[PDB]
């Protein structure tokens, strides 16, 4: 298995359960909105969050389909929500009156203006659900930018090998079924990677003081190892192999020695002798 710059991956194996729960909550807002709109009860199965290069995602995306760009302040970049012909078909059929027992294929014809308007109607609802799911974890301002036909026309990422995240959703209304995806570049969530790795927390006021107090009150007394390096000399394997008792290895004048824990300097001191012991007259702790 060779190494290539084409694999420009910040490969992820964490659970991303914060992303999972926020996707579930967004699907929840979308379900309530879609029940309100189409007068029918749907079910959204949130598929497994997928991590794949942009080229692979574009190839897997069924052409033709509808794509739409979102700008998410304060994060720089763009989101790539993709709506399938199947879901726009089901939505328009249910809105205009039908049973869906007579599906029609997609022949490459561009979507009608009415179909685009229905797409916008469901798109603003999806964006509002996206935003109100986000602001629980982190306040994000999401706004629609423009619509696109082909995936190669979205220029979502600088490189086709750029790593991206895809959240799929399977929306079913009765026997009617469809799918739609939400695509975000991994650079969108690089700054908040740790936030999305850890699960969201509900308490926001009590903890802020109870732990800042209790943690110091209890870590007040807990023993930790420390080692002070009095000297520092460089040698060689030759001198180490020939190292025999009775020789002297030169050392410069140590004006100050460093006491450290597991290597990290914690304080500086001057060595000395007190009550028959190797004592340290400290000067200050490194900040």
């Amino acid at each position: 298995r060779p190494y290539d710059p084409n694999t420009q991956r910040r490969v992820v194996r964490e659970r991303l359960q914060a992303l999972e729960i926020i996707n579930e909550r967004f699907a929840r807002q979308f379900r309530m909105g879609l029940f309100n709109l189409l007068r029918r009860s749907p079910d959204i199965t949130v598929g497994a969050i997928r991590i794949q290069p942009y080229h692979e995602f574009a190839r897997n995306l069924p052409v033709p389909t509808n794509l739409n760009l979102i700008h998410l302040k304060p994060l720089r970049g763009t989101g790539l929500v993709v709506f399938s012909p199947s879901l726009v078909f089901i939505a328009v059929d249910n809105l205009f009156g039908g049973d869906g027992r007579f599906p029609t294929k997609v022949e490459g014809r561009e979507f009608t203006h009415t179909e685009q308007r229905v797409i916008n109607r469901m798109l603003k609802l999806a964006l509002e659900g996206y935003s109100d799911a986000w602001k629980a974890i982190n306040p994000l301002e999401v706004e629609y930018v423009r619509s696109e036909m082909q995936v190669k026309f979205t220029n979502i990422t600088t490189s086709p090998n750029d790593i991206v995240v895809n959240t799929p959703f399977h929306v079913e209304i009765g026997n009617l079924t469809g799918e739609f995806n939400i695509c975000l570049p991994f650079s969108m969530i690089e700054p908040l990677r740790e936030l999305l790795v850890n699960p969201p927390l509900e308490n926001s006021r009590h903890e802020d003081q109870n732990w800042r107090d209790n943690l110091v009150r209890q870590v007040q007394h807990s023993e930790l190892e420390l080692v002070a390096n009095f000297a520092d000399i460089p040698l060689r394997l030759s001198q180490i192999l020939k190292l025999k008792p009775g020789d002297v290895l030169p050392i410069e004048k140590p004006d100050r020695i460093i006491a450290h824990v597991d290597g990290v300097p914690v304080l500086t001191s001057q060595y000395g002798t007190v009550n028959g012991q190797y004592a340290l007259r400290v000067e200050h702790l490194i900040n």
């Binding site: 420390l226 390096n229 009775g246 290895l249 190797y278």
Partner: protein, 83 residues
């Protein structure tokens, strides 16, 4: 012995002590702490965090140096690490 020439970082340690957060916090200018090592007891020779031998500081013609006393002594090493 094709690896004959490699630099290695030597270090010495005086001693350690049971030493906690609040009492190190209380440390200020002129504060004194003690270590386990006795006065005149040989300091410990390590490299990159592993014991090698023991040695004491010696002042000859005003220049400092370290004079070693023991070898790695694997049985003594076993005894030391069994602590």
């Amino acid at each position: 012995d094709l690896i004959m020439d490699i630099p290695v970082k030597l270090t010495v340690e005086l001693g350690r002590t049971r030493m906690t957060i609040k009492e190190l916090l209380r440390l200020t200018q002129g504060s004194v702490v003690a270590l386990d090592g006795l006065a005149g007891e040989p300091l410990d020779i390590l490299i990159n965090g592993y014991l090698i031998a023991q040695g004491e500081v010696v002042v000859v013609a005003d220049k400092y140096g370290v004079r070693i006393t023991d070898i790695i002594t694997p049985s003594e090493r076993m005894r030391r690490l069994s602590r």
